[PDB]
Structure formats: structure tokens, C-alpha cells
Coordinates of C-alpha atoms and ligand atoms in Angstrom, one line a residue:
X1 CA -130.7 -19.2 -186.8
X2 CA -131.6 -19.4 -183.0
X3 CA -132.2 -17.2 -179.9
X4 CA -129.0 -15.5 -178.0
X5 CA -130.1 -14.3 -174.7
X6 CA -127.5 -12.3 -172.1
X7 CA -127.4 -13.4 -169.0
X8 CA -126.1 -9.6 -167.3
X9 CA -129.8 -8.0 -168.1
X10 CA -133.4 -9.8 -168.8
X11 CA -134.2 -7.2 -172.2
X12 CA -131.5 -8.4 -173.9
X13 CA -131.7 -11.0 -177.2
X14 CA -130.2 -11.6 -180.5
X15 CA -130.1 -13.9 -183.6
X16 CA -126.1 -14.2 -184.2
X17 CA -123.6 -15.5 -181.5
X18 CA -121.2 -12.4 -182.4
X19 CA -123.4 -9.9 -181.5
X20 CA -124.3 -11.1 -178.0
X21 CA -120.5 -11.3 -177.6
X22 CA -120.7 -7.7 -178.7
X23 CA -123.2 -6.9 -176.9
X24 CA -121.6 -8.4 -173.3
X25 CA -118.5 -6.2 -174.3
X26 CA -119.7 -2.9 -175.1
X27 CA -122.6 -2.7 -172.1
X28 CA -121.5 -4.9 -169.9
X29 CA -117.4 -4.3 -169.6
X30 CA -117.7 -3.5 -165.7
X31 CA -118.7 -7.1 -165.6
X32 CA -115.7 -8.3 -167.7
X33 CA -113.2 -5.2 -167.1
X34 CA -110.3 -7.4 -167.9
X35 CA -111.0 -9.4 -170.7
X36 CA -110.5 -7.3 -173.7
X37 CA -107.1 -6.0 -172.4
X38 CA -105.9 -9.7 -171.4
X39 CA -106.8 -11.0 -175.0
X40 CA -105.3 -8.5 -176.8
X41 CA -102.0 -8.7 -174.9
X42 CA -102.5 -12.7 -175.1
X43 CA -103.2 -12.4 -179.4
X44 CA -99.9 -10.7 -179.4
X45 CA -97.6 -14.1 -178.8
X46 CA -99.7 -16.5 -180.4
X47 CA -97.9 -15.4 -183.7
X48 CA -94.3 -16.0 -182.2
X49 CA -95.8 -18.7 -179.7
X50 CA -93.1 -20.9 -180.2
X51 CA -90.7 -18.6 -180.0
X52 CA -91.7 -17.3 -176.8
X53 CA -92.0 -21.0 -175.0
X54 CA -88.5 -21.3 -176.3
X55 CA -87.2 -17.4 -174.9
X56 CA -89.0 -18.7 -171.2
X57 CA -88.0 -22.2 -171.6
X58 CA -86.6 -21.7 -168.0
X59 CA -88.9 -19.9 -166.6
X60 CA -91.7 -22.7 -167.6
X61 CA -90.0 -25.4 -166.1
X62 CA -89.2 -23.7 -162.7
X63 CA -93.1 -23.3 -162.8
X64 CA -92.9 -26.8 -163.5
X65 CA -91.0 -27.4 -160.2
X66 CA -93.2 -25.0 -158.3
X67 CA -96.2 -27.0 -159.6
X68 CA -94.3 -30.4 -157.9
X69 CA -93.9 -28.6 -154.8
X70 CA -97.1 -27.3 -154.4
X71 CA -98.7 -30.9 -155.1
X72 CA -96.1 -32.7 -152.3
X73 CA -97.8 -30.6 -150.1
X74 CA -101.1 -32.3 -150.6
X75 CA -99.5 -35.4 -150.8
X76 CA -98.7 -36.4 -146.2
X77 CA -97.6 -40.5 -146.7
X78 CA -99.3 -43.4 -146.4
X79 CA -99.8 -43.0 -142.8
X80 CA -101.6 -40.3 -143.0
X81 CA -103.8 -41.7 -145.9
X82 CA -104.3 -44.8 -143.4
X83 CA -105.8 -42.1 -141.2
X84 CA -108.6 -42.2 -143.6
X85 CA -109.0 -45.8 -144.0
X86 CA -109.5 -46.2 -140.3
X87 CA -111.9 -43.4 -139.8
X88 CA -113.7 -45.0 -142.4
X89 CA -113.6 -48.8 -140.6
X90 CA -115.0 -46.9 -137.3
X91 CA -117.8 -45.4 -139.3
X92 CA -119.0 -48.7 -141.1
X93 CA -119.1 -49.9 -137.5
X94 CA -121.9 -47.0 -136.8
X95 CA -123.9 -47.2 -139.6
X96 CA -124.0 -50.8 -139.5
X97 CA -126.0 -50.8 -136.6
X98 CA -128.8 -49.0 -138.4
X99 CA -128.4 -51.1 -141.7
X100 CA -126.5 -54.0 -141.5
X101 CA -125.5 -54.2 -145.1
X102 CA -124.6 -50.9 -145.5
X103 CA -120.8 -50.2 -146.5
X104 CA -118.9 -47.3 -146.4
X105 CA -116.8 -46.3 -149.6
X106 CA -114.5 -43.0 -149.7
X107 CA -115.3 -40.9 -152.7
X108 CA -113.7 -37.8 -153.5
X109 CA -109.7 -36.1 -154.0
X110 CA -108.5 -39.0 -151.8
X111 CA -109.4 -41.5 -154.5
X112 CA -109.0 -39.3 -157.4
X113 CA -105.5 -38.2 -156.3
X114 CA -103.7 -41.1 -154.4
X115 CA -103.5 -38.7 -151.7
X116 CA -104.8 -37.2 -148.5
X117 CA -103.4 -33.9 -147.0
X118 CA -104.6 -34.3 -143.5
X119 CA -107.6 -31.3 -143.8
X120 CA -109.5 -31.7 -147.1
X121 CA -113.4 -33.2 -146.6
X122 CA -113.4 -37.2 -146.5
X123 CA -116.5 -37.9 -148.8
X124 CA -117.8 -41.1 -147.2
X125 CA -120.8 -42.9 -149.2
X126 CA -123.0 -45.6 -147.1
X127 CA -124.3 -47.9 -149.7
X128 CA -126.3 -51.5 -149.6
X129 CA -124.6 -52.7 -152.6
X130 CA -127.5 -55.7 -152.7
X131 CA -130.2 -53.4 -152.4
X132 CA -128.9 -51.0 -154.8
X133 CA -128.8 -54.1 -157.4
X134 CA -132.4 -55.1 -156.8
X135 CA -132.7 -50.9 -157.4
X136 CA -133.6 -49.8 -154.0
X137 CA -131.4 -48.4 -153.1
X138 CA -131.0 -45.2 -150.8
X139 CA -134.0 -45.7 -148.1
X140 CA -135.8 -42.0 -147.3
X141 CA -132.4 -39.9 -147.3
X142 CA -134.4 -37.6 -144.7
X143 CA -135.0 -40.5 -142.2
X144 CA -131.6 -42.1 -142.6
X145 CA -129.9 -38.6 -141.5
X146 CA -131.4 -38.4 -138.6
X147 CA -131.0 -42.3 -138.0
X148 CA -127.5 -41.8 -138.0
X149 CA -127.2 -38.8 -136.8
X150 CA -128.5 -40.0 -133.4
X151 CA -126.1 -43.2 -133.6
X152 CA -123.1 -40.9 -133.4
X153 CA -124.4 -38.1 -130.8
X154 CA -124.5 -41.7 -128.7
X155 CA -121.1 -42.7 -129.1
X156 CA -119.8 -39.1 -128.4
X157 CA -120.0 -36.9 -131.3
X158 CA -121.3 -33.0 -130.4
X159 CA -124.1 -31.3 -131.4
X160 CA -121.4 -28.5 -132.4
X161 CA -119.6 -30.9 -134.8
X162 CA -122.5 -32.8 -136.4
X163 CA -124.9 -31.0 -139.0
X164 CA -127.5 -33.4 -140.0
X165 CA -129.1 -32.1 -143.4
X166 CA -132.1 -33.7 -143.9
X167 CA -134.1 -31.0 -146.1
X168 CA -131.7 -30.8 -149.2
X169 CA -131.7 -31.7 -152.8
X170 CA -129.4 -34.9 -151.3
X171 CA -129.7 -35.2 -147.9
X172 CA -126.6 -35.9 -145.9
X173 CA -124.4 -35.3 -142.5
X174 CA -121.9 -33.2 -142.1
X175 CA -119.1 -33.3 -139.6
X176 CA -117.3 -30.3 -138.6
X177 CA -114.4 -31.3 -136.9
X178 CA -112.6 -29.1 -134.2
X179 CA -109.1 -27.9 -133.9
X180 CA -107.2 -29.1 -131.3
X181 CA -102.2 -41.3 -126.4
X182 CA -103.5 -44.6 -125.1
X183 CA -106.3 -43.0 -124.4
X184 CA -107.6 -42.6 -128.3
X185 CA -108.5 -46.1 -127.6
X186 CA -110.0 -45.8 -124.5
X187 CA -113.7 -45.5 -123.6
X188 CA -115.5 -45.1 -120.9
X189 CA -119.1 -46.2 -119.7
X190 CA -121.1 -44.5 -117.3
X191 CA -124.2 -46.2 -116.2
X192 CA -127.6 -45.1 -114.2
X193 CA -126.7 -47.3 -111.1
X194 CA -124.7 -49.7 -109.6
X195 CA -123.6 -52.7 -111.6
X196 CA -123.9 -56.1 -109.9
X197 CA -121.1 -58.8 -110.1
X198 CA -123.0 -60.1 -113.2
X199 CA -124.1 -57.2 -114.5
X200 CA -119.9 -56.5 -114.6
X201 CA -119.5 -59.4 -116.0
X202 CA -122.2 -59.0 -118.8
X203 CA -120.8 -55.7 -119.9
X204 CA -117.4 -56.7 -120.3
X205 CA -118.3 -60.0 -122.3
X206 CA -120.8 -57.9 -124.8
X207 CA -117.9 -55.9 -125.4
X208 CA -115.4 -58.6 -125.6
X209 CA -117.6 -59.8 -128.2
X210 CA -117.5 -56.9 -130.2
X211 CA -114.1 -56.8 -130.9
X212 CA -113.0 -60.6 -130.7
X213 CA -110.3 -62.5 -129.0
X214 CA -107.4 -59.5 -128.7
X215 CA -109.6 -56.4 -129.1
X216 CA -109.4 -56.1 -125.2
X217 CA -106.0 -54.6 -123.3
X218 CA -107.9 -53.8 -120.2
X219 CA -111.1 -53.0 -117.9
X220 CA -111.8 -51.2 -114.6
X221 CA -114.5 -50.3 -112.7
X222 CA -114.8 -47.3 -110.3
X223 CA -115.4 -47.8 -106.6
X224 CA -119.7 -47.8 -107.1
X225 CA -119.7 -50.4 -109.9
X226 CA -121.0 -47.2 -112.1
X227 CA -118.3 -46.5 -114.5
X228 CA -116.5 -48.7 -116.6
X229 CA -113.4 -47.9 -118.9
X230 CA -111.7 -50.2 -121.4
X231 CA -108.4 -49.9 -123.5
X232 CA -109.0 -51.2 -126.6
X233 CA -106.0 -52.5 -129.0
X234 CA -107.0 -50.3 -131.4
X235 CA -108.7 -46.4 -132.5
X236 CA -111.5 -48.5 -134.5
X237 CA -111.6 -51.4 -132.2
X238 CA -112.5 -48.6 -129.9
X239 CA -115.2 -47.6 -132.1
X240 CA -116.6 -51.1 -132.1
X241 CA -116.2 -51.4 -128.5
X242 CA -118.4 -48.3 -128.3
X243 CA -121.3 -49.7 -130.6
X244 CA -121.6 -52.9 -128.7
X245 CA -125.8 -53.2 -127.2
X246 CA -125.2 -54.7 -123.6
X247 CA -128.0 -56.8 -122.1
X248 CA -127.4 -56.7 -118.6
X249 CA -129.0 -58.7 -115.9
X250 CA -130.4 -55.6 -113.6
X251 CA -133.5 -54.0 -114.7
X252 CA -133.6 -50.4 -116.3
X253 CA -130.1 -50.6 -115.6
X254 CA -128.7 -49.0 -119.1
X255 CA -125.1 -47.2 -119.9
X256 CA -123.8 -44.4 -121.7
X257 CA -120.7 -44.3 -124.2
X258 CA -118.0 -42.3 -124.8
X259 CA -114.1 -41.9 -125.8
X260 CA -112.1 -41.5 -122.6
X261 CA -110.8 -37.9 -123.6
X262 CA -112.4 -35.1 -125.1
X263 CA -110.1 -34.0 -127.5
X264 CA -107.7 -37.4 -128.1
X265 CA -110.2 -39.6 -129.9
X266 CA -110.5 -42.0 -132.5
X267 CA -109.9 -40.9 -136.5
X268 CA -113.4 -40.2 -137.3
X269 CA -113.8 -37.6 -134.3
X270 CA -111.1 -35.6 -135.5
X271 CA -111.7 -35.6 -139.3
X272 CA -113.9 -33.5 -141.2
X273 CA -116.5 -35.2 -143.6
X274 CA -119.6 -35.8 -145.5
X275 CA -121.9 -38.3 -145.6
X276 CA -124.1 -39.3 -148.6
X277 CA -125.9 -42.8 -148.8
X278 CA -125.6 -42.7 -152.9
X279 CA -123.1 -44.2 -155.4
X280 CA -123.0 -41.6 -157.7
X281 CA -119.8 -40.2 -156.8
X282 CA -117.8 -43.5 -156.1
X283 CA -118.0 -44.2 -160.5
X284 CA -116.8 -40.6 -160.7
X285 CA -113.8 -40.7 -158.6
X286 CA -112.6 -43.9 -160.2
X287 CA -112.8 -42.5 -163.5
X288 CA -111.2 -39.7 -162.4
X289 CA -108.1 -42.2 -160.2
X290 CA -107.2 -43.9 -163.4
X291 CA -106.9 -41.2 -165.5
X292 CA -104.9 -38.9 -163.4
X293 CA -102.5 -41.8 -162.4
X294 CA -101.7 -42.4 -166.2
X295 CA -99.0 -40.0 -166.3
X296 CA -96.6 -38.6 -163.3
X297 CA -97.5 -34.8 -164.0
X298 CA -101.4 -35.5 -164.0
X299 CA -101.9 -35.0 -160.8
X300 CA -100.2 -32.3 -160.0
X301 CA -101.1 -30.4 -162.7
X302 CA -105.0 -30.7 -161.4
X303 CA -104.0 -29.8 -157.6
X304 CA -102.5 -26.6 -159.0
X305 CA -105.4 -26.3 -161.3
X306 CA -107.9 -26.5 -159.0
X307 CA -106.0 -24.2 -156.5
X308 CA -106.7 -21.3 -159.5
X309 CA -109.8 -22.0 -160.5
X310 CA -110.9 -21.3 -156.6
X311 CA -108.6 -18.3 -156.6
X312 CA -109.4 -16.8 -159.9
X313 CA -113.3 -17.5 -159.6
X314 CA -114.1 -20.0 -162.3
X315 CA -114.4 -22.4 -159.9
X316 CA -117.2 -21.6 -157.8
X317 CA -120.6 -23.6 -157.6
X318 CA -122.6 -21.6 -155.2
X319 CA -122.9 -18.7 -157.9
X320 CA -123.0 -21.0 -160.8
X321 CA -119.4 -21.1 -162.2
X322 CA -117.2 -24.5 -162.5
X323 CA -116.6 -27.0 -159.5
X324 CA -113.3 -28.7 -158.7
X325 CA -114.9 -31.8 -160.2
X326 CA -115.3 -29.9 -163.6
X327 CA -112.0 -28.4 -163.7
X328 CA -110.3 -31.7 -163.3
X329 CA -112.0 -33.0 -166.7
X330 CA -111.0 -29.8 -168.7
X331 CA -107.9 -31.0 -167.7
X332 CA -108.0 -34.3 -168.4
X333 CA -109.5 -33.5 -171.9
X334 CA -106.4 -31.2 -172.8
X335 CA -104.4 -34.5 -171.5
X336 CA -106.2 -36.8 -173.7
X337 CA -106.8 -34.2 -176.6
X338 CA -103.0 -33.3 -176.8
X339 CA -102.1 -37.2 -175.9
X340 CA -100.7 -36.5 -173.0
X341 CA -102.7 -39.6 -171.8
X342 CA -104.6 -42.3 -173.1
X343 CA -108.1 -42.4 -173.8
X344 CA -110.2 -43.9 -171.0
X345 CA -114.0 -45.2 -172.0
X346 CA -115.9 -44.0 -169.2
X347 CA -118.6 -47.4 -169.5
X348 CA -115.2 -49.3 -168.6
X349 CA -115.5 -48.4 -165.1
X350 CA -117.6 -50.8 -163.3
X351 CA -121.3 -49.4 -162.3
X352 CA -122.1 -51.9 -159.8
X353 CA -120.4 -52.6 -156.9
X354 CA -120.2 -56.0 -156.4
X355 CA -116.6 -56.7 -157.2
X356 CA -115.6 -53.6 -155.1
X357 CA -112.2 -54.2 -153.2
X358 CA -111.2 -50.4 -152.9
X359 CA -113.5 -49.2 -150.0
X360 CA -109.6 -47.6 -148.9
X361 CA -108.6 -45.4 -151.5
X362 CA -105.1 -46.8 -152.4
X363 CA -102.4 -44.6 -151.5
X364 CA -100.2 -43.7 -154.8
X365 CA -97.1 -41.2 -153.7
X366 CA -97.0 -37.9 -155.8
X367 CA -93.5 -38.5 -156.5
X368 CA -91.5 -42.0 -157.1
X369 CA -89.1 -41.7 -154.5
X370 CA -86.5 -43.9 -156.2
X371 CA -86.7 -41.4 -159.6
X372 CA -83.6 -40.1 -160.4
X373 CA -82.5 -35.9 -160.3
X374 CA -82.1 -36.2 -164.0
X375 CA -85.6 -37.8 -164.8
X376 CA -86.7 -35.8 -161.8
X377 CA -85.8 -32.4 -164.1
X378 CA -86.9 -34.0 -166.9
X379 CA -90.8 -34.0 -164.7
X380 CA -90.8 -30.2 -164.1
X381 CA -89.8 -29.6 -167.7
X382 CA -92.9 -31.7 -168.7
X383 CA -95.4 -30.1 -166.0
X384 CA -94.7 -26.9 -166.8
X385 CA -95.0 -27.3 -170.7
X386 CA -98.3 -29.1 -169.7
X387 CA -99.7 -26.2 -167.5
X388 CA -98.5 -24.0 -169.9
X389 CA -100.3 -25.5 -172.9
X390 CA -103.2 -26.1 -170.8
X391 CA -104.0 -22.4 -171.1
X392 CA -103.1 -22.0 -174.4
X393 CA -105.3 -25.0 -175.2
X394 CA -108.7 -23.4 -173.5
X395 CA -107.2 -19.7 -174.7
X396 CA -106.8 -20.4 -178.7
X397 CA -107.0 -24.2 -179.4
X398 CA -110.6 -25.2 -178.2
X399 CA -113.6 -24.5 -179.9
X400 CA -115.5 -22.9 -177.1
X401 CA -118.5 -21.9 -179.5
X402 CA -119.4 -25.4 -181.3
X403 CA -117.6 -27.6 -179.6
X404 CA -118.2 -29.6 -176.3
X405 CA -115.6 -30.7 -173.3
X406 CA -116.1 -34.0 -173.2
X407 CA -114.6 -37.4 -171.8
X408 CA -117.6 -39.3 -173.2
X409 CA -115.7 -40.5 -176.8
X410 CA -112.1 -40.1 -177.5
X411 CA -112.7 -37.3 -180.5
X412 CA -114.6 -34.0 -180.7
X413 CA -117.7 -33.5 -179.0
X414 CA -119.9 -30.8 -180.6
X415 CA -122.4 -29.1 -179.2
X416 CA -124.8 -30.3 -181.8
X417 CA -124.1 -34.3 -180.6
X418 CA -125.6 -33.4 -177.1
X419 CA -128.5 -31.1 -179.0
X420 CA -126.5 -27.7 -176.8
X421 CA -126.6 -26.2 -180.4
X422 CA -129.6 -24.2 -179.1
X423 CA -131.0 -22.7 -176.0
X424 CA -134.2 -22.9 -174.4
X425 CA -135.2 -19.4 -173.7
X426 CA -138.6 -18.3 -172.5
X427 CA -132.2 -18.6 -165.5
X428 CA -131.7 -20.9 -168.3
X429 CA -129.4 -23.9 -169.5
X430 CA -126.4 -22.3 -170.5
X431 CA -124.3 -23.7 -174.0
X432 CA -121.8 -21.0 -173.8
X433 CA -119.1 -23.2 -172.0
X434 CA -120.0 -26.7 -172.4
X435 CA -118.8 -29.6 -170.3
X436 CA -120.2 -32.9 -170.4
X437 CA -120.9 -35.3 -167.1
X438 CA -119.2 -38.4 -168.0
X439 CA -122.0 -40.4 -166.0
X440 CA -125.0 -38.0 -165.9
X441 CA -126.5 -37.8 -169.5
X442 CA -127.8 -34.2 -170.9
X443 CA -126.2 -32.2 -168.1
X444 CA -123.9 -29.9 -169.0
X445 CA -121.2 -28.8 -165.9
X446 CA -121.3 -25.0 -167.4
X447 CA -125.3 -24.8 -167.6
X448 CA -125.1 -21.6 -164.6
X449 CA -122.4 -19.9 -167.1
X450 CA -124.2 -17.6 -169.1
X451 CA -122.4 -14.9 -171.5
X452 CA -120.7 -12.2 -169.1
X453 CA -120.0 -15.1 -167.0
X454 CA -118.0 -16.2 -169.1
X455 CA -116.0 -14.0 -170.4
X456 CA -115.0 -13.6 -167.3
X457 CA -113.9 -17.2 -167.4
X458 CA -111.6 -16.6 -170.6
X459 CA -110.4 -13.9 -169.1
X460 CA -108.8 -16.0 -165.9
X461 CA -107.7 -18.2 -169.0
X462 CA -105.9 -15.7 -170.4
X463 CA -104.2 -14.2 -167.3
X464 CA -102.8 -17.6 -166.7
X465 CA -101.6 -17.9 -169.8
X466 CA -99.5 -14.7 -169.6
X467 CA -98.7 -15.5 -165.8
X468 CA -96.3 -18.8 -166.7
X469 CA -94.3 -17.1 -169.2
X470 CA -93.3 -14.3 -166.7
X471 CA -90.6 -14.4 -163.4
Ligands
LIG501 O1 -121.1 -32.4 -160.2 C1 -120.5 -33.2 -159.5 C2 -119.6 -32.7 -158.5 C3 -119.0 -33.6 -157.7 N1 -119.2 -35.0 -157.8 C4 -118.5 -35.9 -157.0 O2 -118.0 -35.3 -155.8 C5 -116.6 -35.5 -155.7 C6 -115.9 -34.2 -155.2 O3 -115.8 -33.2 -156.2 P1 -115.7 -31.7 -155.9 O4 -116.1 -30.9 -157.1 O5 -116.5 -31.5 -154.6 O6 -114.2 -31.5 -155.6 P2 -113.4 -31.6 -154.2 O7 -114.4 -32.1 -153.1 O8 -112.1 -32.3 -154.4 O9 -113.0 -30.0 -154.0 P3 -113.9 -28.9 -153.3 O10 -115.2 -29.6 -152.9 O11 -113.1 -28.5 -152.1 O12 -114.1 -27.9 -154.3 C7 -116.1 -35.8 -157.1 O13 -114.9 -36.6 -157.1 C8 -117.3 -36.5 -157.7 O14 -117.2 -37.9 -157.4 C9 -120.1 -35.4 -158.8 O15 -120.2 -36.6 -159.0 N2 -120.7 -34.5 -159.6
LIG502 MG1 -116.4 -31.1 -152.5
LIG503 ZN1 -127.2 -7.5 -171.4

């Protein structure tokens, strides 16, 4: 016997489950319009289920080829995942100026997927891996923003793209890039007076020193000794051509940076991305990677996923439904629950960072290339059974009322094991859709969901369902 509060109006409380179901269904069905009439049209196969995935046999797997075309879109080669990898080089070289044993790892789809589209946020983490083992690790997030902040209005970046948030829950930067070639690599330096012969001389070495013995291609000076520009070998050797501190000879003689062009610049100027100075996300993604890469339809199957869960609603964080993140471990759980793919131990992904070698998210093509038509068939067959099931999983199969989503152990999760059997009520933790964080202990992923909310999850669930058995 416990509480059941609603979550659609504050004078509303029971001591069954069924009844606050009832309850949400009866007064609060302008909330909810579709659910009733979804599940009853949904009830109606699950008696001749197999029957019907037989009958649309075709129609599933030309889903299942729509699903492989709409994750090739995400996927834009190696190239352009090296886009990343540089952007990310150019930024170690800024931030290492305000800590010197500060890294940058990626974070985020790029790692979890193998892939970058081109568009999608770059998650970039700034981490002193030493520090963070002696367990002090980030500084004051608020001072650090602004620290680095102020390194990159220096080297060029706008006011208009860069969005420093130091008063948040965790404080970070945020860089909005704009919308739109030698001279990527170029920079140019304007100083407050005339350079000498020696002050010349002094500039060029610092540089030269900041990108080694072939990081130069060339250097001229304007007619007033005032303006030097350099060509660089490379878009992140221009970076760290940019971040060199010249001493020069003459006093209060000093210089201002910049890339050459305004709008042809160096990766991380033209890439949008955030920038967090914890580790929390780098354990997540990796967890994430491995599981998604042990089977070819994986990964598709979550970019589609995640492209309805934005579109139907459930996945929206700023008015308390799922995120992207969470959506990815229902479907990994259906994977691993249905044994689609094997189970991974979350512990068995390192927590320290010490023997970190992937700071570049390695680049895994959606497709094998070399596959051949008839196994290539044989993939949209299986992705389309798997999307299919998906929703019939989280529609019929899964215990939504006593049992918990969970990655945590390899068998079922109740919602007793975590102590979500009950409620605290006195905008409450929600136990009506439970996910478990893999890393974060006692937080559940669907704590904003309360009753109406979601129902109006299973109904998306059940409109899916209906929506991959249909031309
Ligand atoms: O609750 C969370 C959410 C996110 N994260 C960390 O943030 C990373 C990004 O997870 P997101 O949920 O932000 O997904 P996304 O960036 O790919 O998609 P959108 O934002 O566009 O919806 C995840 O890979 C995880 O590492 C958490 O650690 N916990
Ligand atoms: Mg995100
Ligand atoms: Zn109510």
C-alpha cells in the first residue's frame, strides 16, 4: 500500500496504481487524446502478432532499408570525422595556455556512433586527468569559463559566436558557429607600432617555435613593420601559431591575432560546440561506442530512434520527458534483453583516464563497404524486425509498472532493487517510467515523467508500433 499522486492536477491522490491510471484517463484525456484509441487498435494484432509481421514481412524490411538510408546520412567519411579531430587539436592548444595539463576529449554522438554528420554539437571535455586522480578536479567552473572564454575572443572568436555560461548548474561555453583556401591557415598580426629589425625577428622565431621545424610556409610584413601574416602548414598549426606569447624587444610594443579571413578559418571557428571541464560524459559515451558497434543494425536503429523520440515528444528534456542519451539505453536494453547484443558490464569501462588513447573518436563507417547485396538485404531485413520489435517490446513486453530499464546487470531490474517501489510525496521523483543512469547511482532518467506524461509516452509507443506495419 503506498501513495499515487497525478502529476496533471495538485488534489489528486490514490492508494492503487490502477486507479491513478484511471483517473489520468477519465479527467485528464485532453492530455492523452490519443492513447486509448492507439491501444486498442494496437491490442487488436498482438493476438495474430505473428501473423501480421509475416503478412508485412515486406513492408518491415523496406523500413529496414529506409532506416539504413536515413543513418548514411549521418554517417559523412572519415574526412569529415577528421574535421573533428582537428578542431579538437586547435582547441587543446587554447586551453593549454590557461592550464597546461588540461586535455581535450570529444564526448557525445561522435563517439557513441562512429560518426560525424558535419552539423551536430561537438561535446569537447577539458580535463587534468592528474588532478582529477588526486580528486581535484574541475577548478571554479565559473572562473574557468570566463578564463577561456577570453583566450578565444583573443585569437578571433566573436562575441556573436561565443556564449560563456558561467551561472549554470555546470558551467560551460558555448559556440555558435555561423553559416557561411590557403588562407584557413593563414594569420595575421597587427601590432600597436612599428616593429624594429629585431622586433621582426623576435616575432617570427616565437612563432617558429610554436609550431617546430616545418610548421612555417611563409611570413611578410607590410610596408610600416605593423602587420605581420604567416601561412602555416596546417589549420591547427595555425591555431598554435596564433597562441604563441611573443617577447619582443621594443617596449609596450604588443600584437593582436587573428585568422587571415573572416569566414575561411580553421575547424574549430566553423564548428558548433560545447565545452564542459568534467569527465562525466566521456565514461558514458564509451559505454554507449561499444555497445552500439556490437551489431551492424545498432546504430542505426538509435539514429532513427532518436530522430522519433524528438519528433513524437518523448524525447524532450527542457519539459521533463526523455533525452537522446536515455533513448539510446531503452534501446540498447531491448538489444541486450532480446539478445540482439551481448551484455556489457558497465564497471568494465575504465573510470580514470590515464590509459586514455581515444581523445579522437575513431571513425567506424555505418555500412561495411565491401558487404555483399545479398548480406546487404539480409541488414534491412534484420533492422526492420529490430525497430519493429522495439515497439512491440516497450508496447506489450516490458513491465513498465515494476520493472526498471536498466543496463546496470544483465537480468531484470525492478523497481524495488533501486527502492522506486515508492514515491516521495509531500514536482516529485517520478517511478512511473523508470530508467536507470548506468554511472549516476539513484537517479532515474524518467524522474520529470509523471502519470499523464506518460501516457503520452505509450502512446508515441504505440503509434510506432502501428506505423512500421503500414505502406
Ligand atoms: O543525462 C545525461 C545526458 C547526457 N549525458 C552525456 O551527454 C552526451 C550527449 O547526450 P544527449 O542526450 O545530449 O544526446 P545528443 O547530444 O546526441 O543529442 P541532442 O543533445 O541533440 O538531443 C551523452 O553521450 C552523455 O555522455 C550524460 O552523461 N547524462
Ligand atoms: Mg546534447
Ligand atoms: Zn489529476
Amino acid at each position: 500500500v503506498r501513495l499515487y499522486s497525478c502529476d496533471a492536477c495538485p488534489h489528486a491522490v490514490f492508494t492503487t496504481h490502477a486507479a491513478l491510471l484511471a483517473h489520468a484517463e477519465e479527467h485528464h484525456a485532453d492530455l492523452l487524446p490519443d492513447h486509448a484509441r492507439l491501444r486498442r487498435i494496437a491490442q487488436k494484432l498482438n493476438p495474430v502478432w505473428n501473423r501480421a509481421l509475416n503478412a508485412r514481412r515486406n513492408t518491415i524490411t523496406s523500413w529496414g532499408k529506409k532506416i539504413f538510408h536515413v543513418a548514411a546520412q549521418r554517417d559523412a567519411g572519415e574526412s569529415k570525422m577528421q574535421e573533428a579531430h582537428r578542431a579538437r587539436a586547435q582547441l587543446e592548444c587554447v586551453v593549454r595556455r590557461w592550464h597546461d595539463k588540461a586535455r581535450v576529449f570529444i564526448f557525445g554522438s561522435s563517439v557513441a556512433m562512429g560518426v560525424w554528420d558535419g552539423t551536430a554539437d561537438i561535446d569537447f571535455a577539458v580535463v587534468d586527468v592528474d588532478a582529477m586522480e588526486r580528486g581535484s578536479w574541475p577548478p571554479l567552473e565559473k572562473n574557468a569559463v570566463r578564463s577561456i572564454t577570453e583566450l578565444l575572443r583573443r585569437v578571433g572568436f566573436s562575441f556573436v559566436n561565443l556564449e560563456p555560461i558561467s551561472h549554470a548548474r555546470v558551467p560551460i561555453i558555448k559556440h555558435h558557429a555561423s553559416s557561411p583556401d590557403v588562407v584557413a591557415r593563414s594569420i595575421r598580426f597587427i601590432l600597436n607600432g612599428p616593429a624594429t629589425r629585431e622586433d621582426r625577428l623576435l616575432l617570427e622565431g616565437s612563432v617558429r617555435d610554436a609550431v617546430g621545424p616545418t610548421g612555417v610556409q611563409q611570413v611578410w610584413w607590410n610596408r610600416t613593420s605593423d602587420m605581420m601574416s604567416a601561412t602555416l602548414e596546417s589549420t591547427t598549426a595555425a591555431v598554435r601559431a596564433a597562441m604563441c606569447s611573443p617577447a619582443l624587444a621594443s617596449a609596450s610594443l604588443r600584437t593582436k591575432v587573428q585568422p587571415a579571413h573572416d569566414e575561411c578559418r580553421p575547424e574549430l571557428y566553423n564548428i558548433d560546440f560545447a565545452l564542459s571541464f568534467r569527465a562525466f560524459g566521456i565514461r558514458n559515451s564509451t559505454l554507449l561506442r561499444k555497445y552500439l558497434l556490437s551489431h551492424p543494425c545498432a546504430r542505426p536503429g538509435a539514429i532513427v530512434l532518436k530522430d522519433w523520440s524528438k519528433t513524437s515528444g518523448v524525447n524532450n528534456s527542457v519539459n521533463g520527458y526523455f533525452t537522446s542519451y536515455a533513448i539510446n539505453i531503452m534501446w540498447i536494453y531491448y538489444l541486450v534483453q532480446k539478445g540482439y547484443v551481448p551484455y556489457v558490464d558497465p564497471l568494465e569501462i575504465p573510470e580514470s583516464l590515464v590509459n586514455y588513447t581515444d581523445f579522437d573518436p575513431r571513425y567506424t563507417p555505418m555500412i561495411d563497404p565491401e558487404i555483399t547485396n545479398t548480406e546487404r538485404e539480409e541488414l534491412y531485413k534484420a533492422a526492420g524486425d529490430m525497430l519493429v520489435g522495439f515497439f512491440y517490446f516497450y508496447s506489450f513486453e516490458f513491465d513498465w509498472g515494476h520493472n526498471v530499464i536498466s543496463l546496470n546487470r544483465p537480468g531484470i531490474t525492478t523497481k524495488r532493487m533501486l527502492g522506486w517501489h515508492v514515491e516521495d510525496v509531500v514536482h516529485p521523483t517520478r517511478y512511473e517510467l523508470c530508467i536507470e543512469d548506468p554511472y549516476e547511482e539513484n537517479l532515474n532518467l524518467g524522474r520529470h515523467i509523471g502519470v499523464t506524461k506518460s501516457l503520452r509516452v505509450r502512446t508515441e509507443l504505440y503509434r510506432g508500433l502501428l506505423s512500421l506495419l503500414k505502406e
